[PDB]
């Protein structure tokens, strides 16, 4: 109702930064981002893995199939996979050996729901190594794969103009 | 008092942190173990960095009749 929320710097105390303006916390955005790993950890990291792997997947094509090293390819193995089914691989363990900055070794299974979460102190960590695996494992099958309905899609193309 | 409109529906209000969408499409365990071997992750990565990376580079460099540098 007010001048702009009940007028506030942060959630509350103004001695943390964030300076909650728009571009920060307008219900206009903060909802375009929380089926995913923004505020709350839906299901485990397991599945988010491939919508992440894949979406980021079929990117990196015209980047390295239309800006490729000797470009505009007449090789049936480009306008798609070619190599770049390398990036996802050079970085699908650019990750795994970051989840070695996560260990914390468990097995609960709580992607099913109980009592309206919080995951509470959900900030900081509170996602162990046996989580960051099933994500960067979702990554490989999201990267490699997400590279082919790029490739596989013929190419009907809109052009210059 | 007409513009005292009793806040034309309060809302409740604050929706929530509560509850402005259900969740994630039911597509899941349609990958259960499907693609495992990073879902058998129980000791690996050393395997995929000789394997994958000896076949992004073994045949990837070699070639039977140049099309040279």
């Amino acid at each position: 109702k007010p001048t702009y929320q009940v007028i506030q710097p942060l959630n509350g105390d103004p001695f943390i930064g964030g300076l909650e303006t728009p571009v920060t916390s307008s219900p206009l955005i903060a909802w375009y981002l929380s089926n995913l790993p923004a505020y709350r950890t839906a299901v485990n990291p397991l599945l988010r893995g491939v919508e992440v792997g894949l979406a980021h997947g079929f990117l990196l094509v015209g980047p390295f199939v239309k800006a490729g090293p000797l470009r505009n390819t007449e090789y049936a193995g480009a306008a798609g996979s070619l190599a770049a089914a390398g990036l996802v691989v050079i970085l699908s363990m650019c990750l795994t050996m970051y989840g070695i900055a996560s260990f914390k070794e468990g097995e609960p299974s709580i992607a099913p729901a109980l009592t309206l979460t919080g995951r509470k102190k959900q900030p900081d960590q509170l996602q162990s190594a046996d989580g960051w695996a099933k994500f960067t494992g979702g990554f490989f099958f999201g990267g490699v794969s997400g590279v082919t309905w790029a490739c596989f899609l013929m190419y009907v193309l809109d052009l210059p103009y | 008092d007409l513009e005292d409109i009793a806040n034309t529906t309060g809302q409740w209000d604050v929706y929530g942190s509560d509850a402005p969408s259900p969740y994630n499409s039911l597509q899941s365990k349609f990958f259960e173990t499907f693609a495992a071997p990073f879902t058998k992750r129980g000791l690996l990565l050393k395997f995929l960095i000789l394997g994958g990376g000896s076949l992004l580079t073994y045949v990837s460099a070699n070639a039977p009749q140049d099309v040279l540098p």
Binding site: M93 | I49, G53, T57, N62, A63
Partner: peptide, 30 residues
Amino acid sequence: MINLPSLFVPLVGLLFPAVAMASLFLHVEK
């Protein structure tokens, strides 16, 4: 077969690096 001695620049200048940039991220942790 004809003309094929190209593996000792990636196994070195490429893959050997992968190993140690990975591996030696033992400096961070192991």
